[PDB]
Amino acid sequence: YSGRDSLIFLVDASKAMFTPFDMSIQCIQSVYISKIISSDRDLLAVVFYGTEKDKNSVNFKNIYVLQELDNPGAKRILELDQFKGQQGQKRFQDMMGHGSDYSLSEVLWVCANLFSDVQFKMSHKRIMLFTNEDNPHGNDSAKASRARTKAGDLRDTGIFLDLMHLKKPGGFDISLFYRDIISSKLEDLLRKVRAKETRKRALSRLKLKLNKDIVISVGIYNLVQKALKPPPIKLYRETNEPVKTKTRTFNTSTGGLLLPSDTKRSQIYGSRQIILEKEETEELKRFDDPGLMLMGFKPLVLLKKHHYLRPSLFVYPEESLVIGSSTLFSALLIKCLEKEVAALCRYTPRRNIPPYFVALVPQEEELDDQKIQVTPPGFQLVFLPFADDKRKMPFATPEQVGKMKAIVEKLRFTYRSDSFENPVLQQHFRNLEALALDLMEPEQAVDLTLPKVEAMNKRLGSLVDEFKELVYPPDY
Amino acid sequence: NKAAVVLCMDVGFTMSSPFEQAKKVITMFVQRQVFAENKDEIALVLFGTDGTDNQNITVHRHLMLPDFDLLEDIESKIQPGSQQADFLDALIVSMDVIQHETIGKKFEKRHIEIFQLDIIIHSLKKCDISLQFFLPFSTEQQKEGLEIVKMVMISLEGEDGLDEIYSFSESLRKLCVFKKIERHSIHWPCRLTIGSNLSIRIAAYKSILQERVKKTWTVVDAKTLKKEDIQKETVYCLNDDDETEVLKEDIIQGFRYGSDIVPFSKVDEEQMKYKSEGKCFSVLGFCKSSQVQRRFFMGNQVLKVFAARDEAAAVALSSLIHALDDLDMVAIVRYAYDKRANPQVGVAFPHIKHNYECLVYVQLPFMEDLRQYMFSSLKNSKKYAPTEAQLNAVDALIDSMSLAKKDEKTDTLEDLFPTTKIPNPRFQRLFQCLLHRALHPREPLPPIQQHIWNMLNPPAEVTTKSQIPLSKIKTLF
DNA sequence: GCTAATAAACTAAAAACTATTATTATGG
DNA sequence: CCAAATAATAGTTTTTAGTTTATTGGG
């Protein structure tokens, strides 16, 4: 589902100041950083309603466009920072004024035009509204009706607008004007917990051949993938522009450039120099037709977690060209209570690729109390280690047992699934954002992965002190 | 580490065919010796051979490292003889030629195979000389000598000696000696730390390491057949109208920061980034096995942890293992291999074995690695509700394949189709292709060597049993 | 007076997600 | 031998599995 998730920011530049505007800027701040580090495949825009220096494509009054819909950029944040803080505030009232007339219909119209101007594939039309009044549109009912009609039209178009409260308490629902059709995120956009990668399609579709002929379409999804830093780009020390690399084979001072066909593959064992070819070499790794054929069934008793392989994956019922595949998936998956005898298969992604035996563990439907399905039912694609994966293995009174039982019981952790982040990755992100944006003097974040020193000791107590009861502790 | 093997065969009309089996076993054994990267010095002796090298014992090959040429010479120049001579003289000659080999270069273990008595007793039972006597079965002087050796070896070894006879059927149908391929591991000394008060020295080992390759693919020219006539050159063409070379100091490690690329130098990263200094192998927290799920088992290396190589630490670790086992407690460990290591987070759980108790460790993912994919539940999807006939069919299919030994209750279930003990077939295929190339550098397209399918495929009787449920399911659809 | 190895990012393709192309079958 | 309407291969940039590096300790 390729596309763009647009979002436009508009703030009360004519009534908040006639700090609350500063808070809006701060909430807007770092959202661009979050999108940059999370997903650049999106466009964001900022427009102000109520200003002496209006600017928009249709050139309506009191409508000022700062940034149109575009991928977030460092220059965009840098220029927006000119209107950050109190000095940024006064700059805002200086170079573009404030306290002009407001026209909700006009700003809705111009933002709809902005969405119309988008050329990319679209995914989700979102509008975020900032205002310090629940009912600032107590003006002429004609303007209210026009704004409501335009809101209905854009909602029918697919444009979705979300309005949130601000400094004004806005008792209960409030929003006396917007409650007709529109029905907090200060912290959410302010917490700026920014670490995210993209999501697109899944792994290769495999033909689940049960015996030899019946084909079942499948879909492999990878729920966990190792995080990696963005690839470095070779630049020029004089102009900072990317340099296209060039590599070629030379024949050691003869003159000719050796084509890949000119050379040959080789290996050296003992005395002989065995010579192969690239096509031959790649043909060696081919074993069989890629697919999913079931070896049989093996009970979940001859499977211990001490042996482990590359991280397991998830397979989902997919019906691409075979009808009834989902029905067979449903029939097999519910066999989980009696199917403790895990089935066996060898995983071959494509041809010319080594095959790996992989067990599939029936995952159940982990529906939550919130009626939200996490980890939809499927099969855990656990990889089975081979014989060459094991290396050499080298060659208790109950009172001690109870002692550290109390130790590990006094101090524990609930094991939040999302509570540990790689310090290197986040500190690198901090470095990038510091050297690319404001806070030009760098800052460093804090990692929760570091174990405590005294807080853990206090939550555990001084028990460990007298729990050094082992005779001659192995300390050197 | 060190091995010393010699060949002594009772070749002739007596093997006329067990001789073919012995020949092919010899060939595969020497192939394993060559491909296993061993430092053994093999020597070959002959008896009853035309010509005298001095008792009709003619020495053919002295000690040297195994190679393809030796195997080719064995295959070609070695043919069955038509002479009879005393095998005791051959044994004496073998011992005499191994004496100077032992003196010149020390070894560790001796192993001899096949496919007066006082001298044998003295020489074999002296320091480490040993052999395993394989029989082709399942003249009369040869039989009496065979019996004498049988009583010698069952007296020397005991009950193990009694059960050390295998037929060639057990060397071909099942595998007797075929897995002489292994990789060495490096021990990692460390010191487990619990908070601030506790710091116990531990030994860490790579339990399950991913498959590697000993050598690397070398590119050679089709005419010079050597890397010395190949010059690999990589240059950085400046983005200008023509080719203008740019040297490495003019290269900046720019990073795509969103819609912009910002210059950076790798040295600057080190200047203004931080990593976990030193080794940091410390516990972080405790939780229940229920919270931990196989869905969060990331990483590749499996780190089994033992006590430091003291005994007080060993029993402390054993008691901790028991404490985590009986309470089903799983500990959270912050792992750092060394000073330059990436900061890793993972979980270690006890390993239960009769001989010893170990602490195996695996790495855990951060929230960035985890991804969410909302789907539609199929167990309640009425549009794809399975039919009860399909339920019966899949039930009849499930019990069709029972690879475990679910026949005795007093004895545990044993897999009839072992899986984890099967090595990588690709390495064996590569070795066989290399052997084909060495023997047939002109003949292309080495055969696929189909016999690797049989141990890679389920038992034939399992397939025949499965034939019926798959047939009934096919009629269902 | 000492090469038993490994925490390796590089130049890695062996997915193409969704967007113009053509040959086909033409037709009256 | 020109005479148009309609599938098929293939211009993007996406994840991941062989790749190449500095720190280990043996005359």
Numbering used by the authors:
A (entry chain B): 32 to 49, 58 to 222, 237 to 448, 454 to 534
B (entry chain C): 6 to 21, 29 to 66, 75 to 135, 146 to 168, 198 to 368, 370 to 537
Lines from the paper:
Non-homologous end joining (NHEJ) is nearly ubiquitous as a DNA repair mechanism and is one of the two main mechanisms utilized to repair DNA double-strand breaks (DSBs) in humans. In NHEJ, DSBs are first recognized by the Ku70/80 heterodimer, which subsequently recruits the DNA-dependent protein kinase catalytic subunit (DNA-PKcs), a large protein kinase belonging to the phosphoinositide-3-kinase-related kinase (PIKK) family. The final step in NHEJ involves DNA ligase IV (LigIV), which acts to ligate the two broken ends and forms a constitutive complex with XRCC4 known as LX4. In this study, we present monomeric and dimeric NHEJ super-complex cryo-EM structures consisting of DNA-PK, XRCC4, LigIV, and XLF.
While classifying particles from the DNA-PK-LX4-XLF dataset, we identified a dimeric form of the assembly that differs from the Ku80-mediated DNA-PK dimeric arrangement seen previously. The structure of this new dimer of DNA-PK at 4.1-Å resolution is mediated predominantly via interactions within the circular cradle. Specifically, the loop of residues 898–901 (loop 1) interacts with the loop of residues 2567–2572 (loop 3) on the opposite protomer. There is a further interaction between residues 946–950 (loop 2) and 2578–2583 (loop 4). The arrangement of this new dimer would allow the PQR and possibly the ABCDE phosphorylation clusters on one protomer to be in close proximity to the kinase domain on the opposite protomer. The juxtaposition of phosphorylation and kinase sites within the dimer may explain how these residues are phosphorylated when they are distant from the kinase active site within the DNA-PKcs monomer. It is also apparent that the LX4 and XLF interactions with the DNA-PK monomer are largely maintained in this dimeric form, with a single XLF homodimer positioned along the dimer axis. The distance between the two DNA double-strand ends in the XLF-mediated dimeric supercomplex is ~115 Å; this compares exceptionally well with the previously measured distance between the two DNA ends in the proposed long-range synaptic dimer complex as measured by single-molecule fluorescence resonance energy transfer (FRET). Within the new dimeric supercomplex form of DNA-PK it is clear that there are major structural rearrangements compared with the monomeric supercomplex structure, with the most notable changes occurring within the head domain of DNA-PKcs. One of the most striking features of the new dimeric structure is the ordering of a helix (residues 2737–2765) within the circular cradle of DNA-PKcs.
